[PDB]
Design a protein around this ligand. Structure first.
Ligand SMILES: CC(C)CCC[C@@H](C)[C@H]1CC[C@H]2[C@@H]3CC=C4C[C@@H](OC(=O)CCC(=O)O)CC[C@]4(C)[C@H]3CC[C@]12C
Ligand SMILES: CC(C)CCC[C@@H](C)[C@H]1CC[C@H]2[C@@H]3CC=C4C[C@@H](OC(=O)CCC(=O)O)CC[C@]4(C)[C@H]3CC[C@]12C
Ligand SMILES: CC(C)CCC[C@@H](C)[C@H]1CC[C@H]2[C@@H]3CC=C4C[C@@H](OC(=O)CCC(=O)O)CC[C@]4(C)[C@H]3CC[C@]12C
Ligand SMILES: CC(C)(C)c1ccccc1Oc1ncccc1NC(=O)Nc1ccc(OC(F)(F)F)cc1
Ligand SMILES: CC(C)CCC[C@@H](C)[C@H]1CC[C@H]2[C@@H]3CC=C4C[C@@H](O)CC[C@]4(C)[C@H]3CC[C@]12C
Ligand SMILES: CCCCCCCC/C=C\CCCCCCCC(=O)OC[C@H](O)CO
Ligand SMILES: CCCCCCCC/C=C\CCCCCCCC(=O)OC[C@H](O)CO
Ligand SMILES: CCCCCCCC/C=C\CCCCCCCC(=O)OC[C@H](O)CO
Ligand SMILES: CCCCCCCC/C=C\CCCCCCCC(=O)OC[C@H](O)CO
Ligand SMILES: CCCCCCCC/C=C\CCCCCCCC(=O)OC[C@H](O)CO
Ligand SMILES: CCCCCCCC/C=C\CCCCCCCC(=O)OC[C@H](O)CO
Ligand SMILES: CCCCCCCC/C=C\CCCCCCCC(=O)OC[C@H](O)CO
Ligand SMILES: CCCCCCCC/C=C\CCCCCCCC(=O)OC[C@H](O)CO
Ligand SMILES: [Zn+2]
Length: 340
């Protein structure tokens, strides 16, 4: 059985530990602040707050495991924590990955319901968000539990201990099949669902006219309500046309800050960037690398497999970066921190 003599040193053995240190420092800080802010500076929690707290919980838990991984790279890739801790290290990475994707889908589906179908179902949205969150954690734990079988420690020829990121050669093909099932069900399907929600969010927002406020008095002109007292039909745009309150001209009017529109665009921008930079490259490369390891072990393919392996290492770092990028979403796409 021919095998491609893999030789990649001086790059990946510096990159991943540096990214892991960066993610630990920024991720522990941001998620500690977020978890502190939701628990002690938010009462009651809205629908999105429940999903955002769960996303922060998935990130902090994963961030908590990083020093072990950083140690492993600083210890010439020799795992000293045992078989069980290796399995738990790998399980948590995948639980964080898929839990994050599913909670991002929850936030996306929730904003679509708020933007398209807006009425005060405050407690109804909170109770449903808690129930959905529990189900999401149950789905993720169950679907990701095989990682506890596949992953584990292995003794190298030089007597060192590897903590397998995938699995042993005996279960590798089975692992690829399993990974394809989770890639399709917990990455591909949520991605199509997020895109649909975002397309419908952008469609609903672009089809509606913007409100204008007076800098002199503070009167808000609604395009749908209009101003029939002066001679403006309800439904007409601001450009189609004096202020009914104070009496100043149109020149003293500026566009109103819409909280739902701003939080929706921020979510659309941040999530799409995160899928384009982290989620999509990682899933493509994870798959490509397993495919090369299983089906492309011929001398003519070795050079290409090396490039795939190196590119995959890059995406592993990008995948981990989400843990320190996600807190930004709680302050730019989330509800204000208030205790009522
Ligand atoms: C309170 C938080 C927000 C501040 C973050 C503190 C950092 C300065 C700490 C936390 C994680 C630490 C790392 C955790 C793990 C390791 C692995 C450790 O590995 C070894 O000891 C193996 C050496 C060998 O056996 O050859 C070396 C220190 C290092 C890089 C640590 C250096 C200092 C770090 C980056
Ligand atoms: C039997 C086969 C066909 C199932 C395929 C597996 C997955 C494609 C399914 C199973 C569980 C599903 C998840 C179950 C629950 C949700 C919560 C849902 O969030 C809401 O309903 C938000 C409600 C709100 O707060 O307004 C968004 C989709 C999502 C992640 C689903 C996405 C698709 C998943 C991963
Ligand atoms: C308007 C549409 C076309 C933009 C779609 C946005 C994303 C879905 C794109 C932007 C960057 C793309 C990635 C750019 C680079 C690669 C590396 C590429 O790796 C290889 O070619 C392997 C061998 C090598 O490293 O040369 C595999 C596809 C992938 C992940 C691409 C998958 C699709 C991504 C994430
Ligand atoms: C977080 C637990 C559940 C222990 C864990 C599970 C699986 C794999 C690794 C793992 O964590 C560790 N295992 C062995 C050695 C180190 C760790 N992790 C660890 O030390 N995390 C840590 C987290 C926070 C922390 O406080 C600090 F941020 F530095 F202020 C100091 C250390
Ligand atoms: C009730 C809800 C949450 C559905 C959960 C279904 C779970 C139990 C399913 C979904 C995907 C499945 C895996 C898909 C592929 C493989 C590879 C095969 O070689 C061994 C079984 C294994 C590893 C499956 C075991 C069961 C599995 C983990
Ligand atoms: C709260 C604010 C959020 C802060 C967000 C943190 C900023 C992102 C950090 C680094 C970007 C990633 C750079 C990726 C560079 C990869 C290219 C590379 O050099 O990797 C090759 C390596 O040798 C392996 O083979
Ligand atoms: C909000 C506050 C801002 C926080 C921002 C701070 C983030 C630190 C950034 C880079 C540190 C990474 C250090 C680079 C360490 C490289 C690891 C290495 O040398 O590899 C180990 C090697 O394998 C052993 O032989
Ligand atoms: C109703 C709510 C139900 C919630 C469900 C809770 C499930 C917890 C999930 C993972 C923790 C288990 C971590 C398992 C760590 C692996 C250890 C192991 O199994 O040991 C391997 C081997 O035997 C040693 O050599
Ligand atoms: C709710 C309950 C949650 C489901 C619990 C464990 C899922 C099964 C994980 C075990 C994966 C075994 C992989 C396997 O069957 O592969 C062996 C095959 O012989 C290779 O060729
Ligand atoms: C209500 C639903 C609650 C269910 C929650 C799901 C949690 C599943 C727990 C373990 C997965 C089964 C995988 C078994 C992991 C043990 C490790 C193993 O399989 O051993 C491999 C090898 O022998 C050692 O090197
Ligand atoms: C929606 C967002 C758009 C999704 C973007 C890319 C999808 C993945 C397609 C990339 C598949 C890699 C191509 C491949 O399979 O070629 C590798 C093979 O080893 C050589 O023969
Ligand atoms: C139509 C709706 C599109 C939605 C799918 C979105 C992203 C697919 C990218 C993740 C899937 C993993 C890559 C696909 C793959 O299998 O190609 C690699 C190949 O196996 C190696 O030779
Ligand atoms: C609406 C806002 C959406 C914003 C849209 C943003 C588009 C993202 C573009 C590129 C990120 C993909 C990064 C892919 C990482 C591959 C790096 C690589 O090629 O690996 C190097 C390796 O060393 C060589 O062999
Ligand atoms: Zn006025």
């Amino acid at each position: 059985s021919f095998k491609c003599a893999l030789t990649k040193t001086g790059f990946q053995f510096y990159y991943l530990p540096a990214v892991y240190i960066l993610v630990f420092i920024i991720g522990f800080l941001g998620n500690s602040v977020a978890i502190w802010m939701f628990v002690f500076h938010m009462k009651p929690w809205s629908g999105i707050s429940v999903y955002m707290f769960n996303l922060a919980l998935a990130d902090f838990l994963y961030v908590l495991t990083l020093p072990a991984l950083i140690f492993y790279y600083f210890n010439k890739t020799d795992w000293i924590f045992g078989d069980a801790m290796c399995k738990l290290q790998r399980f948590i990475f995948h639980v964080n990955l898929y839990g994050s994707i599913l909670f991002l889908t929850c936030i996306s589906a929730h904003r679509y319901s708020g933007v398209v179908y807006p009425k005060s179902l405050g407690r109804l949205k909170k109770k449903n968000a808690i129930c959905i969150s529990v189900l999401v954690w149950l789905i993720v734990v169950v679907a990701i539990s095989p990682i506890l079988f596949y992953s584990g420690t292995g003794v190298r020829k030089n007597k060192t201990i590897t903590c397998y990121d995938t699995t042993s050669d005996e279960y590798l093909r089975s692992y690829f099949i399993y990974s394809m099932c989770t890639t399709v069900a917990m990455f591909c399907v949520p991605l199509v669902l997020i895109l649909g929600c975002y397309g419908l969010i952008v469609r609903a927002l672009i089809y509606k006219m913007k409100k204008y406020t007076c800098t002199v008095c503070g009167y808000i002109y609604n395009p749908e309500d209009g101003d029939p007292d002066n001679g403006v039909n309800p439904g007409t745009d601001f450009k189609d046309i004096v202020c009914p309150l104070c009496g100043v001209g149109k020149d003293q009017f500026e566009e109103v800050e819409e909280p739902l529109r701003r939080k929706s665009i921020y979510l659309v921008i941040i999530v799409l960037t995160v899928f384009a930079v982290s989620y999509i490259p990682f899933h493509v490369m994870k798959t490509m690398n397993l495919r090369a390891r299983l089906d492309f072990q011929t001398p003519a393919m070795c050079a290409f497999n090396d490039r795939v392996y190196a590119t995959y290492q890059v995406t592993r770092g990008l995948a981990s970066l989400n843990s320190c990028v996600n807190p930004i979403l709680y302050f730019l796409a989330g509800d204000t921190f208030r205790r009522r």
